[PDB]
Amino acid sequence: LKWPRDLRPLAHHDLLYMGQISEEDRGDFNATLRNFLVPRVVGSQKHREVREFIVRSLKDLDWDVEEDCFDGQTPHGIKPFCNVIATLNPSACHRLVLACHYDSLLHKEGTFIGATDSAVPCAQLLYLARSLNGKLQNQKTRGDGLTLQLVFFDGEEAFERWSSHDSLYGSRHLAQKWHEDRTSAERLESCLERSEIANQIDRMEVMVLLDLLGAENPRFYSYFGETQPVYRRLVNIESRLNDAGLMELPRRRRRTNYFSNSSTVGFIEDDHIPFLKRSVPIVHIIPSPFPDVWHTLDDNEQNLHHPTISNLNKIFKAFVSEYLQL
């Protein structure tokens, strides 16, 4: 079946512009990232400070920001959780949703930063909102029924052994909340003609979930045939950026190959699961294999690979620009 929205290839001018990273761009991203490179344990002061920083950053950009807060039972007793949902144009029927988790694992061995997991994704979402703000604010005026939404999930990590009941606290909560919140196309602005809207979850046109990003040479695959048309845009954008010589490589005459033009047989549990189960199309931007530092105390700032992060930022900026026709 065809994707419900016609995907217009990015004009060369826009590809080149989105594929630019200046010294001011690097500095802004790095300043943003520094705010996340702290332990973010559920219920802790630093976790609250990170949430407040996300919320303030997006409110300052004139986004609608909801703090979806609740208490949930865990193997460590009752815990507070707060998802952050930022929506550029609340009234727009359809949302391109970009997401990640902002909590960090309570690690048995000691202080755990979770730099890839998911401090970098968090910073990338805020960087997108900041770097594209002018274009996003212009797009919001169009009345085209499409907008950008950023979701920062709380409580992705298990407190003890990962299980259906101990993991994905924020995403399970939000998916259920939105699924049970009934609405219809008539209540919303400019829904696509053949849309079936019965609840808030139906407004998530596609959820692009970023996780475990920041290590060198990640390998992505299309995890869902349903979103192959969207995934293939990431493949294409990466190819075009390489052809134009806009990717950072350590030697001349190399290419990045992050987005494999294949699917893989791999089952990964993550914040998309509660949405997938409710028919939200998913693009899961998570590497396979996971970074070598995964869930070790070495998942820290110095083990990040900055040229890779820069390259990913170019792909993501170009992707959002293409999808929203910025």
Swiss-Prot record:
Expression sites (tissue/organ): Detected in salivary gland and midgut.
Sample GO molecular function, one term: glutaminyl-peptide cyclotransferase activity
UniProt GO BP: peptidyl-pyroglutamic acid biosynthetic process, using glutaminyl-peptide cyclotransferase
CDD domains: M28_QC_like
Residues that, per the record, bind Zn(2+): 117, 157, 295
Compartment annotation: Secreted
Phenotypic effect of disruption: RNAi-mediated knockdown results in reduced enzymatic activity in midgut and salivary gland tissue extracts. Weight gain after feeding is reduced. Females lay very small eggs which fail to hatch into larvae.
Activity control, per UniProt: Strongly inhibited by PBD150, 1-benzylimidazole and N-omega-acetylhistamine, in a Zn(2+)-independent manner.
Annotated function: Responsible for the biosynthesis of pyroglutamyl peptides. Seems to have a preference for substrates with neutral or hydrophobic amino-acid residues at the second and third positions.
Name by which UniProt lists this protein: Glutaminyl-peptide cyclotransferase
